[PDB]
């Protein structure tokens, strides 16, 4: 069954690519990594940056998540990070995403052992 760590990746990495390039990104890769099969998944975002630069995060800095939870790290460098936001013309299973491009820090929730990211917390 999808492990934590591997939908981490699923929902949030996008390595292949240093930036969207398109608006259309938000709506290829929302539908491509099946995250609109249920339902239009309201908010997401998509990091480009090599995994292993973000399972590093584990390790950087200790900040409380935003639900309170103290198991969330805040990057010490800012990463480019694609938010994908769902438009007023979203309908299910049309799930429509407005693209933003951004530079930021972002804060993960960690698990396990290995210790990886597990969730996609925030991003400032």
Do not use: W
Request: charged share 20%.
């Amino acid at each position: 069954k999808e492990t934590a760590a591997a939908k981490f990746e699923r929902q949030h990495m996008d390595s292949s690519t240093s930036a969207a390039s398109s608006s259309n990104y938000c709506n290829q890769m929302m539908k491509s990594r099946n995250l609109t099969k249920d339902r239009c998944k309201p908010v997401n975002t998509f990091v480009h940056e090599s995994l292993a630069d973000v399972q590093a995060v584990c390790s950087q800095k200790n900040v409380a998540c935003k639900n309170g939870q103290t198991n969330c790290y805040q990057s010490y460098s800012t990463m480019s990070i694609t938010d994908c936001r769902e438009t007023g013309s979203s309908k299910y299973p049309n799930c429509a995403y407005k693209t933003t491009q951004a530079n930021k820090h972002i804060i993960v929730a960690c698990e396990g052992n290995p210790y990886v990211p597990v969730h996609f917390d925030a991003s400032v």
